[PDB]
Design a protein around this ligand. Structure first.
Ligand SMILES: Nc1ncnc2c1ncn2[C@@H]1O[C@@H]2COP(=O)(O)O[C@H]2[C@H]1O
Ligand SMILES: Nc1ncnc2c1ncn2[C@@H]1O[C@@H]2COP(=O)(O)O[C@H]2[C@H]1O
Lengths: 981, 978
């Protein structure tokens, strides 16, 4: 019956796809040709005639209900959603206007020239059936050799919208023509138009949001989400099919776009499985419909032969080609003026990009089968088969020729240079490892000709002098900046979108002109000036159990509206609404203790309750949702702008220190350094102004990039640990799943701005001995002094003024060999100036804006006199300065070799100070104390009578020590007991 | 009509699967419970009654033709094929015997005790319907917490074979019971049995091989192979369904097993897509059939209430449980004796491993629907629903309790120690990178509490003294050997199977007893003593070519009308065509009769068949080379694997022997451990050497197949490092890495057939640059092929010069004098300066392995020198070789040639010549045209500074003119490179 035909069709499609892969002509036309052969065999042998008659004469219902929604759903599934949304406005405008112009022009051309006794509706149906297209072949060719990304997305989106509008027009006009028993008045026609406009896509959006919310609560389960997605898609299609014969495909398209847009709630395995499954179904449908078209056209059009239609076909193709070119040629200056400009290469490649696919053949089969025994169906089928089999080869050959000639698919010089360098590096490394392997003991009598020929690799590709030198120098500088950007991305310091924005900004201004870097485009990239801030300014300035119950009651009030739009239950529903109003009155009575005297907005709700249509109650809960989503929407773009600004700054800083060695001409080097430093200084001030506008964006981006850097380095560490054999494959995978989970949780990070860190709470918590004395010191010291870049607070050798503790920022200390230290938030500086009364010994500078608290010598004396009986703050300060002095001289010792900063920090935390007054300035060293450090003073050995002074390390050989008490130098020691105690 | 029921069924299955994931009870019983609820709603409301009446009363044809083949196909698709084949024999024996014993015991128990007026066929049907089971739940539980691999495969294979034989028996009896109008004589019954035996699986094998051969010619295309595989599976099922009512499932199972077995011709993406698609279909079918069973049993069994059946159910469950235990308990000693032994833990976990699934419920629905208005269908459905809903909870709880109690799912000490060490290392690295990141300029006012809490990680888990010390020392040594094996695998020096074999050999002898390493098990691992060599020995010793291939194809075509013979004018024309083919064969034989007219032993039978005029003998002689080549490949793979694992053990022991000494400090333990390790190494090296001696191609194959792996791994690491430095972007890196993946894929199907040994004369002529007739004369005057084994020194430093030696097989190590160590491979020339400079010796060369060398004496060297005198091109080439050998090491170490590798300085100095001192009268002028000037030999006097220098030395660029003094004992020699 039908089995052998389908199996043979699949085998023929497979062999045709495998054979004609190399030729630029798409495979599908071969299928059509093969179908033609079957026709001239179906007229003689009764067996193939029986098989074809059983299969090729199916009902239109199955075609119109199955073959088209699958194809349009596939055309609306494989597209990149974000790239589509980047140009949705121009794509929609161009697609709609091209569709309407092409349809009306084809209709009037047919009526004027064909000399057929047709009506206007037949010609409009002809135009609609000649308007639809399919871009899978041209986008496949572009993927193969076009070397472009945005062009295919533009073509796919335009084709999708064109197909949707074309099938809408064809369905309405076919229903008007072939069923001449329906009223065509305006009152229901406008209702039908608005229904198809608004009711369908909103229903698809609602079901998509519902199923996404359902899938959000599913963890590490793969079958459930696949089955739920398939069932939801079929349910949407079935409700659309019950509703109309048109809006179902629109609802399916919207649902597919929304599902493809979301990525956080669906694991990638499900997405790739769904892509593969839907692609397989679409390919099968396309092959079957092509073979059916071929066999039916060969069996039918042999009795409709004339020279007039053969003359008509060529001029029809010429007319549709010229109008398709002319509409976009006329609309190009408007697009250039509005800002969505496109190059003339894009226009000339768009002119030939219209390839007819399978939608037109489907509609032709439907309109031929519904025509009965009439010549109109044969004319339709023959003309559409002729035009598709003409364009499918001619347009493909011409687009390949134009893509070759225009040279946009040309490998640039840096691409070839980088590929050659990479190939040379790989070959050198392989030669080195071969040389190492040849020296191995067990690698003897291995034929090295086979080994060398097996692993060989190769690339797939194979004042004028001053101006040329400047041009090549700036090209090399652009190359260095690009590789710096890629290095920064690979180390993890950047996000994804900022990286591609920087790369494309560098590329579009690389070889266009002499200027290479611009700042105002970056300015508009990070700042927001569109309609969103104006909408926010208008919106936010012009305007739980009880709320949930009120919302549920308002939703329940739609059921009387449903009945009204369509009894005892309805009266009971009105009584329930009155009871809900009474419950609202009871809620007001309960809130009378808070506020019930008068209200402004609630008068409308009171009037609505007096009427009892309760949709006005839900807008109070709807108000926070709009601000909640728009604040995140603007903050995401603001964070991306700050990120790309920081990336440009750090890239310029990295490339600044290498340009001097690259060139040797003085004038070029000077002018390049001048323009680079002016650009950096111009952008850094605006970045600082953006930071000063609000501080939460910087905090968010720093705390969202530190996690990325830490996770990347942990992944590198675990890969290295796997490479050393200390753990096997399964444990490594089990541990790496945790890293993947951490990254997945980081993906949906709270991009909403975290509150700024507290001032008093962090002051009390960060210091160990937080008490009421700290509060008294804060009340006696409120400076919050701010120092910007390029300022030095104190200098070495200057007289001591007091103690300074930092509350915001990072500072760098240079002291004396020499050392460099970095103090973060919560550090205390100026310590020995109040204890040992030393003027100064080191210089501290600030690399950014810092907020600090100032304590003077008088303030320090007042603080010291504030607590005297139990100076816990003073004792903690003594411990802090003691461990600060003792820390750097222990890790460098040979005894503590192989110890990190945290190891020596946590080793010495369990140590105290020695009371020299109780011990009468005499100490005995035993094995109980693990470490003894001379903090201050001069110590005299009780055995060797040797005098030593701080900074020094007491050896384990010394057992008894004596100290001399002096007012100007009081001896101090730190003792850490053994870890076994 | 049917849509809402299916949609609600899928939603209920989804919510039940999501909710009951944590509890050890499988989700499916909840579905059954939910179905029960629908029943007590279907009896009152006419709407749900209409929906249930429409969907749940489905005809048996769709169930019996759709629901069962999908389930059995899924049970025969997700299995690991190789692990199944490792124990196929014991799995088949145990499954078949357990099935037949359980079926007959259930039948006789039902007939004796149930007091129902049933026949023997009804009880056999009852046993067949109670024998089937499903492995999905138990294997899922074992994947979750069983911590085992082989047990799940054993259970799955047993369940698959049991299901296939059970459905065969059920069909062959149900076709007799409910259709009492068919003859049951032996003559057709034995034909049916042999038909199911041989016709089905062979047809599945043929279609699988045909579609694999079809898919082998498809490159980088994904849709075509998926569509072809699906169409081939349906075509196999349809031909099986037309053929018999039960052969289709067997053919589909065989086709699925063969498709899953193959891996080279199918890309992994297609395989995982097919796995996911088939699993989705099976899950949907299982959920739907469970809900159907629940609703039908609640609607039906409410009018079949008694205490007799409610008492019979418990004793039936007890009887089937005890017989299932007892059959394998009785068969365990036979398995232990035969060598396929299993531990008592495996037996006690296999006893409770029988969980009834969906096949029995499918057969119950079929038999209940075909029973009509009779009590037998209700009894069948109620009893099977009761037993499945009892076992599905009770057996799951008991198997979880037993798995906890028996302690086989316990984390060992080394696992916890390694996990803790890895966690500590990761935390230390993260702390270090956080400390580095805190000092960055642009990382200011970032709340570090959130950063620390976000990236925190943790593990999922949380003379007696002398003997204890020895035990912990040998455990630590085993851990060191295991990590050495993993390091060797990760560096790329091992294959996959040898790695897992060595790891499991280390594991099974780790904590069992005091001994740790055995050698005779490795001996039987690398050597072959099975039935394969004996069958090869008896087989291969007991037994215009294109036109012959065309004649064989025609003889194959002659078999096509034989189907008509088994089944007119066309048949007579077929006989005439066969006679014409016979005449053509006779003409071909007469043409070949000039070379050989007498018929051979097989040719006499061929002539007899031609007189008969069959092609079976021609096909057999065509497939004789096929069986020869597949036997050769099968034996060579095992030999290569054994040699690989032997080499891996040797290099692992060599690595661990250097580090074992530092680990322990007790003298006696260290001495005895070194003694046993060295005795094992010395025992295994001699056997490996003789194994390599017996046939040398295996070693050549394994070396040339592992060098490519090492080179490709290091190239991949280099490309990853280059990507990490930003010199190329993502797309170019992926495009380049595709080439590495293609190289690895081509290496996967490597020519494991043994390459021929390298030639002797051809390599001697080609490897040397100046190969000519003089080399042939030297070979005729020097044929030594001396073989030196390990531990032998050929010459020593200071001994008198004897001649020149050129190495033809092996690698040697030279120690000379600072001091230097050199490695000479095949094709090197040694002992060259001893005849040129008349020097005795200056360095000592030894051999690290067996070496085959050619010996040339001083008299032979003099004869060779006197052989070519007019144009001694061999002598000129030797002078160039010794000149470049002397000049090479002293240039790369110079500051001028800094950053130059060995190949760079080798290819830089190849465009160099010698200076003729006779033509220049021993005076040379150095200009900028010559890039490098090297004093090879002699004393050079500067013409300006009057300074005397001698080789080895480097002439600086400041020196312009030089003079040389000619001496017989020291002739000056120089080399100049442009
Ligand atoms: N080794 C050190 N590490 C960190 N900070 C130091 C070190 N030595 C001195 N300082 C700080 O530098 C300050 C310089 O002036 P003061 O002596 O007032 O107090 C000193 C300490 O706060
Ligand atoms: N630098 C070197 N590198 C490699 N081989 C050498 C080197 N120097 C000497 N030889 C070889 O060692 C041999 C020792 O004895 P002969 O002098 O007969 O010939 C010598 C050369 O073949």
């Amino acid at each position: 019956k039908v089995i052998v035909f389908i199996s043979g069709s699949c085998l023929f499609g497979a062999i045709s796809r495998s054979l004609f892969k190399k030729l630029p002509i798409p495979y599908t036309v071969v299928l059509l040709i093969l179908g033609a052969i079957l026709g001239v065999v179906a007229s003689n042998v009764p067996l193939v005639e029986e098989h074809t008659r059983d299969v090729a004469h199916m009902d239109p219902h199955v075609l119109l209900q199955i073959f088209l929604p699958v194809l349009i759903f596939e055309s609306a599934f494989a597209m990149d959603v974000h790239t589509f949304m980047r140009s949705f406005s121009q794509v929609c405008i161009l697609a709609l206007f091209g569709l309407v112009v092409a349809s009306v022009l084809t209709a009037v051309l047919a009526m004027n020239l064909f000399n057929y006794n047709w009506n206007f509706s037949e010609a409009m149906m002809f135009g609609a059936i000649m308007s639809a297209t399919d871009p899978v072949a041209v986008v496949a060719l572009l993927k193969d050799l076009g070397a472009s990304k945005q062009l295919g997305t533009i073509i796919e989106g335009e084709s999708l919208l064109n197909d949707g509008c074309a099938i809408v027009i064809f369905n309405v006009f076919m229903k008007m023509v072939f069923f001449p028993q329906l009223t065509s008045t305006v009152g229901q026609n406008v209702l039908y138009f608005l229904q198809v406009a608004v009711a369908g896509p909103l229903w698809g959006y609602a079901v998509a949001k519902v199923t996404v919310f359902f899938l959000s609560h599913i963890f590490n389960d793969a079958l459930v989400e696949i089955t739920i997605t398939l069932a939801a898609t079929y349910l949407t299609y079935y409700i659309g099919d019950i509703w109309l014969e048109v809006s179902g495909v629109l609802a399916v398209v919207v649902l597919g776009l929304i599902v493809n847009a979301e990525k956080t709630s669906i694991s990638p395995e499900v997405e790739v499985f769904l892509h593969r499954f839907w692609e397989m179904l679409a390919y099968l449908a396309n092959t079957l419909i092509f073979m059916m078209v071929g066999v039916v056209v060969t069996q039918k059009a042999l009795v409709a032969v004339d020279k007039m239609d053969w003359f008509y076909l060529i001029i029809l193709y010429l007319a549709i080609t010229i109008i398709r070119g002319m509409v976009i040629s006329l609309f190009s200056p408007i697009l250039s003026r509005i800002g969505y400009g496109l190059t003339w290469r894009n226009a000339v490649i768009m002119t030939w990009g219209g390839l007819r696919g399978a939608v037109g053949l489907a509609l032709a089969l439907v309109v031929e089968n519904l025509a009965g025994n009439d010549v109109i169906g044969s004319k339709f089928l023959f003309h559409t088969a002729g035009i598709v089999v003409l364009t499918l080869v001619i347009n493909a050959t011409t687009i390949q020729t134009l893509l070759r000639i225009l040279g946009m698919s040309d490998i640039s010089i840096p691409k070839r240079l980088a590929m050659a360098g990479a190939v040379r590096r790989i070959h050198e490394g392989q030669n080195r490892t071969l040389n190492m392997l040849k020296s191995d003991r067990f690698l003897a009598d291995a034929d090295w000709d086979i080994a060398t020929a097996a692993c060989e690799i190769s690339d797939p590709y194979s004042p004028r002098e001053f101006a040329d030198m400047m041009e090549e120098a700036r090209l090399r500088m652009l190359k260095a900046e690009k590789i710096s950007y890629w290095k920064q991305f690979e180390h993890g310091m950047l996000a994804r979108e900022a990286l591609r924005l920087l790369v494309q900004h560098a590329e579009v201004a690389a070889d266009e002109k002499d200027q290479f870097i611009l700042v105002d485009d970056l300015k508009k990239s990070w700042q927001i000036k569109g309609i969103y801030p104006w909408l926010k300014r208008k919106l936010e300035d012009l305007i739980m159990a009880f709320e949930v119950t009120i919302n549920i009651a308002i939703v329940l009030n739609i059921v009387p509206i449903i009945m009204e739009f369509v009894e005892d239950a309805l009266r009971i529903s009105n009584y329930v609404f009155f009871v809900i109003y009474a419950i609202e009155a009871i809620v007001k009575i309960l809130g009378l203790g808070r506020h019930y005297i008068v209200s402004h907005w609630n008068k409308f709700d009171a009037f609505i309750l007096v009427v009892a249509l309760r949709m006005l109650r839900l807008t109070k809960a709807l108000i926070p949702k709009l601000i909640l989503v728009v604040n995140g929407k603007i903050n995401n773009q603001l964070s991306l702008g700050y990120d790309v600004g920081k990336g440009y700054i750090i890239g310029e800083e990295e490339v600044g220190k290498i340009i001097d060695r690259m060139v040797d001409n003085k004038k070029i080097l000077r002018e390049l350094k001048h323009i680079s430093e002016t650009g950096r200084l111009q952008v850094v001030k605006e970045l600082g102004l953006l930071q000063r506008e609000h501080p939460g964006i910087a905090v968010s981006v720093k705390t969202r990039q530190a996690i990325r850097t830490i996770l990347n380095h942990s992944r590198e560490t675990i890969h290295e640990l796997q490479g050393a054999g200390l753990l096997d494959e399964m444990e490594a995978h089990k541990l790496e799943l945790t890293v993947e989970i951490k990254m997945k949780r980081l993906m949906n990070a709270p991009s909403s701005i975290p509150p700024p860190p507290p001032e008093n709470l962090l002051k009390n918590v960060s210091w160990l001995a937080g008490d009421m004395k700290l509060i008294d010191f804060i009340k006696a010291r409120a400076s919050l002094l701010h120092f910007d870049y390029g300022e030095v607070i104190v200098r070495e050798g200057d007289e001591s003024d007091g103690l300074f503790l930092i509350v915001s920022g990072l500072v760098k200390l240079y002291g004396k060999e020499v050392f460099e230290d970095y103090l973060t938030v919560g550090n205390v500086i100026g310590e020995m100036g109040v204890l040992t009364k030393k003027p100064r010994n080191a210089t501290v500078t600030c690399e950014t804006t810092v907020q600090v608290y100032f304590i003077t010598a008088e303030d320090m004396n007042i603080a010291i006199d504030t607590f005297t009986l139990y100076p816990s703050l003073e004792y903690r300060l003594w411990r802090v300065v003691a461990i600060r002095i003792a820390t750097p001289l222990i890790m460098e010792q040979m005894a503590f070799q192989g110890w990190t900063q945290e190891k020596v920090k946590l080793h010495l935390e369990r140590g105290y100070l020695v009371d020299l007054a109780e011990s009468h300035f005499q100490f005995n060293i035993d094995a109980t104390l693990e470490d003894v450090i001379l903090i201050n003073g001069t110590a005299y050995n009780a055995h060797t009578r040797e005098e030593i002074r701080s900074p020094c390390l007491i050896s384990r050989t010394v057992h008894k020590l004596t100290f001399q008490y002096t007012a100007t130098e009081e001896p101090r020691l730190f003792v850490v007991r053994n870890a076994e105690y």
